[PDB]
Amino acid sequence: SVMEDTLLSVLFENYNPKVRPSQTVGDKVTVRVGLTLTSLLILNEKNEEMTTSVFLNLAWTDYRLQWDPAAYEGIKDLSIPSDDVWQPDIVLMNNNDGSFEITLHVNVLVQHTGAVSWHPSAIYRSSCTIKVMYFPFDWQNCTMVFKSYTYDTSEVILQHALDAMINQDAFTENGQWSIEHKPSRKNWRSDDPSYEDVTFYLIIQRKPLFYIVYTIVPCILISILAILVFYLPPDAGEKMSLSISALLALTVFLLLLADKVPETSLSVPIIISYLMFIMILVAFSVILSVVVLNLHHRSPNTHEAVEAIKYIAEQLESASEFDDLKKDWQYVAMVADRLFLYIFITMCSIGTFSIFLDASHNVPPDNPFA
Amino acid sequence: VNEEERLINDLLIVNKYNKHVRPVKHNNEVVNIALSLTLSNLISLKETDETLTTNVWMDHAWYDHRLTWNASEYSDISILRLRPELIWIPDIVLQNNNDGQYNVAYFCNVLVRPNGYVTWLPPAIFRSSCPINVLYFPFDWQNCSLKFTALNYNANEISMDLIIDPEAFTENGEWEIIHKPAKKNIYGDKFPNGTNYQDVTFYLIIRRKPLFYVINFITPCVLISFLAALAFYLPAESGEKMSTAICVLLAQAVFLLLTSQRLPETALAVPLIGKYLMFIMSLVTGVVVNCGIVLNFHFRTPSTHSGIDSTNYIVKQIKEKNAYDEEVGNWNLVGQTIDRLSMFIITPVMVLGTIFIFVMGNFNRPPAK
Amino acid sequence: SEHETRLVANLLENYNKVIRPVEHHTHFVDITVGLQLIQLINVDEVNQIVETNVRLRQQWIDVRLRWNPADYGGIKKIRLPSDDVWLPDLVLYNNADGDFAIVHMTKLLLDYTGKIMWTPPAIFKSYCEIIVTHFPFDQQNCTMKLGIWTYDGTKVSISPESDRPDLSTFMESGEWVMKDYRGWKHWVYYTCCPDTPYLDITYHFIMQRIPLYFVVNVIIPCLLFSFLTVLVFYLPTDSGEKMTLSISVLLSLTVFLLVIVELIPSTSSAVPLIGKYMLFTMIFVISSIIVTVVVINTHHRSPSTHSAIEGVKYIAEHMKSDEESSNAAEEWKYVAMVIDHILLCVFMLICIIGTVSVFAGRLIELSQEG
Amino acid sequence: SEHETRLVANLLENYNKVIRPVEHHTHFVDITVGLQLIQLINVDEVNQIVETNVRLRQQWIDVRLRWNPADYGGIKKIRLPSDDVWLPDLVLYNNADGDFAIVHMTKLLLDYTGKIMWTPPAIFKSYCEIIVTHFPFDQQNCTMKLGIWTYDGTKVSISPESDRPDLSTFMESGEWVMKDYRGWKHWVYYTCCPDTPYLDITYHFIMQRIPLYFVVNVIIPCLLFSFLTVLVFYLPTDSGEKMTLSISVLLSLTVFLLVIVELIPSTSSAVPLIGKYMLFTMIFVISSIIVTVVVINTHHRSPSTHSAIEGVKYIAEHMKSDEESSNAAEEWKYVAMVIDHILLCVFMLICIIGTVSVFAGRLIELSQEG
Amino acid sequence: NEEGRLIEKLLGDYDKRIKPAKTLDHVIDVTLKLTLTNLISLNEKEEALTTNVWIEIQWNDYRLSWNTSEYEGIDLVRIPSELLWLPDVVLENNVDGQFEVAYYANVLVYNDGSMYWLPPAIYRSTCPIAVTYFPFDWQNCSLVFRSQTYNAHEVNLQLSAEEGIDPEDFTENGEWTIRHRPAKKNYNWQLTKDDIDFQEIIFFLIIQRKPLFYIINIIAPCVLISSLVVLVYFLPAQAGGQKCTLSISVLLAQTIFLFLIAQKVPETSLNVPLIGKYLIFVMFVSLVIVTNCVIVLNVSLRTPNTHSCVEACNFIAKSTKEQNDSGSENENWVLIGKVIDKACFWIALLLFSLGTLAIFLTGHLNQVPE
């Protein structure tokens, strides 16, 4: 009622559809943007794409909707669709790899002296700077820049929420990973008369400790075989054949490893860091296996009248036994002892080194998250 | 036709009804809305990324006080149809499970009652972000929570009050649906001073576990084990076959490894419990240790691993002497050690093999509970 | 011309599209149908999906469509655009995967009378039964039901006319084959609700599948690996001097089908089947294992075999005679007799569960065929 | 406002949107293109498809947009959305891999005199030659033509403005690398018709490949193999006791070489690279092949080998003599003067071959470097 | 020049939905033709393809020859798509995916009723190429397309180019090739008994393929493999006696390689089409190698075991010498390899024959289509 007809009709008589919520070149309208996040569903760590979901809270004031006795004082708060206005078209500078879902054209909260609240949850396809710098334990940062897409801040100003809001306010629980924090910095690239985007930081932390574990097994286990093939020579020298079997087997193993590395980088690649050295630790148990092989190689041989016949007998056996006695001299086992304690050094040392670097990688390059 | 033409002109819907105005009898409480949830189908379950694609019958009820008719409307036909446009439509929001917008549950055929009440109930192909975690894998396999309702409005603008489950469950789920609680509510929050919007809260408690993994997965376990278990048997029946004893452990080794390979593949599909995974890999370890044992203990040994007269006395000297040697080899035989060896194999395959299914049982006593 | 404008204009003036064409509280809108399926472009296997065309032949009438010399006059039977009409929202209840393709915007058969049809070359994706037990040797009948959606009995009505077969227009290059297809009508009211809900046509597709291409290569490695197992047993009698060799070939043999089965879980998983069928290859394969288990365990079986100048000439031939009966004691283990036994033993055992595998094989198909 | 209503109503009334700025028979519409690829998102070799950032700078002119104090007075030049305008159907001839992204319904800037620009922020799907010859180290120039789709030179004409580098905004996350790119104009008149047709912008992308990580992994096995091969020579001459030992190896390795192959040909299948690139890996790898097969067949080669008490002593001594003969026979069979021969015979072959291998490496390394 | 007044006249009277029809019993004459420009995906197992077709559309409508102001101002014209009667095209034949960007484009009116429009369209379709079309003799792709709309008693299409092609604009990223291209205009009356005749457009496309890359893929392994069993066959007459097992190893080796080939290429003709022909020489040439291969071992398995007190004692000993000799002698007689030598030529010619029989017949399916 109370001058219902009259308010209702004047309003839709002087509002304009096609127009900008600003009166000429000032000031413009100070719109409020602030998104509380819902959860994130997929981090395409490989490609650096981000599919999350949040609420685009927008809110400014409309002095063209000031009400009177019955929709002002009648009911100070009323829900009204959009369509009517200036909506945030926003793209993400890096990201906005793709449209909006549940973001725009959903009803709004219109307060009486014109305050506008619009509270929509949405899914959005983004792609941030994760890079090939999202595996070091030190992890890395990112730019997330939101802003419209033909509008040049000149009839409106954008302003934020919190700053401390964090990013682990709604970090996904399901994560085998983690959150150090999300910054928010408003900026105005001068390159452009257009006032643009806002840069949101990604100091993300990625701790999924599940399979690196049994990845540990192959490095240690594989040392097993190692130690094993270098322990077998002064253990049963006649390791002869067998030994070959050790390394067909030691090699294939490390090669299949080479099978899964690619396959794992499928979803997910970056920084050979891991890779990089276990590659070196690769080549290492490559060339040590083999030269020991060499080791083995080694051996240039190995790898009255009555009394006249007796004679002939005496000579037969003693004659070739010094020849085969030779071969004994030629393969005595001086090497076995000495290189199984080279095998001591080589293994004992190269073992506790990538142990180390991995030791140091987790513990050392972690801190600088601030 | 009783003034029909004319009367659906009289009332107008669009022209007499304010499309743009929510006929809530002006500023009061609300018009009183009720939602009904009936799943029509569940097509896909993801363990991975806690996501379910399911179809729901979006059974909705609210009164349209303007829709109260008279003789050549009400009574002419106590029941009639009117599409979505002639129809204010809420946006019922899958408030914590519409992590994928609603399809073919937007603006479709509605049922027009004879004195405003209206009934709109079609199909919803939807996606949901249900509370998976790595804990929805113990046998319980948790309770899936979901809330439905008209998202925007408050307690002064809306109010929604309120069926199993296996009504139309997917039988070619690898899971099992045990139950199915439904109870509405309304709720004010922290920042708001003022209760509002009401919702359909439906918890789904389920369970799942094929009967197909069991078959090819246990198969290898025993298989495998018995090879580690035979390994050691063969070193008696003949442990001189040195090279070919060797071939077996390469062989047994590589077999064991890929098999576990296709295991974390389904394991990525679906983040696996710590309960089950340990038993498998703590115990194929079991074997690995033995194969490495198998090793040293299999090849650990050094070697086992009267003038006329004057002349043939040289040979009977050579004779005895290396007889010491020759026997230095049988020394090594260690054959009263035999039965021990393989009896000392038996003991620990029994202590492990059991320790497992022993663990199998200390968890197989509570669930049968 | 012949009321040219007076007749078309009047028709659209007193024409409406909010209203459906309902005639009193009655017989519902007499909806006719029946099939014209001529192509099945794609269908899967794994997800039992079917994207076919069928021209939906619909037939019904609207009295308002009756005419005089000013419209029948004109040209008898003219064909209206689709637009004008209240179309039924048809759908595959236990299917519906989407979307009827190419129904909007069409052609509609009118008669001066009213007779009306429109057979629309609808192509769509489907989902119906089959399951694990579709490809059996006793077959399955995918149940497909179709009918209006949201509308019960009390309002609306469709009906079938006719038996026509499946193999009518079955895909000729089918890795596969139909036997028969039936469609009968019905109306399904429930004891739930006292309310007459909708009418529907239910198809049933009866057909057996499987290419043979998979078959020619399943069989192959079977036979061939049975060869090797057959050699696994003959070996030891013709060539026991390769005992270690027969071990190698077990390590060999086994890893090879173990690998065969990798394929399978990839492909099976990928092209679905009642696990009931693998249980064949199961035991038959585990058999070769179970049989080299006992035959080479057996094979290894056996502990052993797996004057005074006149005096020393006697100390020496003695040396030879004592040993000689001793060695007799390891040979005493490997009689070269009971080797012929164990291959006879198991030759027959493998001739018989060979005929076994040919058994369930052919049994199955003596049941297929029927 | 300054003229506020009389402003707005005048301008709608006498303005036809549809209508294209056609000013007597002359200049047609002079409209120029200017693409500035802001950056690129992704590209596919296999399927020469790219998703890129383009800001389309579109210019043209409507003298019917000049103004007085009743349009300019009001607000100078302003922002007018698209819609009202006549929009050319721009189209990448040999690209156009589909529809321009977010093109529709954008804004533009008119003058109270008239100067119009339409410069929307596009990103779209492209299509370009790659050929066999792209993943050259030398590169292929992606030929990409742009211009007016269905309008001639009389009706209208698309012109250029701009040469500009490709590496202006090249994705840094290319695996790849640019040489340069240039774009010149052209007008296409046909011997068909005596008429003057529309005008085109032709792109030429000249870039070459390869982030060097690939490189490495694949070649190292190959040095690895070098040493096996090297053993294959060295093992045998320095002891042919474990000949079957090696046999092993022949198996275990060639299969490794097989597995490498699955890996890179997928990528080969994933990405077509000028085929004559593959012959490299071809004969090289296949050398390893012939090598093996001969070295190890030959390694095999060899027929063979790979009183009156007194007169009892001479019957017996004569027995040790002729079998003295025979001994010497088979050792006479594996000499150690010519295995040295195969050593140097093939090792010079391997530094032939090897240097031959190094041939095409080094060759188009003399052209790459440049 | 009456510019305004002529426009506005006939738009008074203008008719949309009404075809420019003398009368209703003769229909309109329509011209069409297609120039291929893009053959995007050839999925021949599934025989479907995607092509950018230039839809040359032409027809006549003198509802618009013009006067002074329009015919004569401009014989040529450009007025909107949405402004009448437009043909929905589709390949009876193939049209599997409703059209892309091939409507809502700019048509062409003559000032007198000549009408031309071209557009470009990417869509799906489904050609021959079932288990054949891989030969050297090509199976012609026959696609007929026509308006999917009305039937021939108001519509009637024209044609072209039945004779002349193909590789105008053929895909370069075919491993195929076209050699003719026919084009015919036809009447409706099919197998199925359908009247009310809808004209159409038949598109024959006999094309070639098989510019094999994989070929030698295929080629080299299996030459290598034949050779590899020629090593198995001649390497035994060089080999020693420890080569029995030797040989076996290679068996393991031999099929490891074998089925790794058999996994490869089976996969290939699933992913893409199918034809038996080529398929067959492979797996059965493969089989029969297998065949004689193991039979071989069985051949060097065969053969039982080849696989005065003074005087007293000097009496017995000199017995054991020559006695046992007759024993060791056993071994001599027994392993007189008459079988092995000959077994070289056995397989030699046999190997030849298999080689010949195969390549020679693949020489024929090359030499008849030559």
Numbering used by the authors:
A (entry chain B): 1 to 164, 174 to 312, 403 to 469
B (entry chain C): 1 to 162, 178 to 320, 421 to 484
C (entry chain D), D (entry chain A): 1 to 306, 374 to 437
E (entry chain E): 1 to 164, 172 to 314, 414 to 476
Reproduce the article's own wording on this structure.
In terms of these defining criteria, there is no distinction, confirming that the sorting procedure was effective in selecting tubes where most channels are closed. While these interactions are not identical in the two closed-channel maps (due to differences in lattice curvature), loop C in both examples (left and middle) extends tangentially from the body of αγ, creating an entry path for ACh at the αγ–γ interface. In the closed-channel configuration, αγM2 bows inward toward the gate (orange bar), whereas in the open-channel configuration, it follows a straight line (indicated by the broken line). The δM2 helix also bows slightly inward toward the gate in the closed-channel configuration but straightens predominantly in a tangential direction when the channel opens (see below). The diameter of the closed pore is about 6 Å at the assumed level of the gate (orange bar), where the lumen is both constricted and completely encircled by hydrophobic side chains. This region and the nearby extracellular region form an energy barrier to ion permeation across the membrane because they contain no polar groups to substitute for the hydration shell and so the ion is, in effect, too big to pass readily through.
The nicotinic acetylcholine (ACh) receptor is the ligand-gated ion channel mediating fast chemical transmission of electrical signals between nerve cells and muscle cells. ACh binds to αγ and αδ at the interface with neighbouring γ and δ subunits, and the pore-lining helices of the closed channel make a hydrophobic constriction in the membrane, which functions as the gate. Here, we investigate the structural mechanism of ACh-receptor gating by propelling ACh-containing spray droplets onto postsynaptic membrane vesicles lying within a thin aqueous film and then trapping the reaction by rapid freezing.
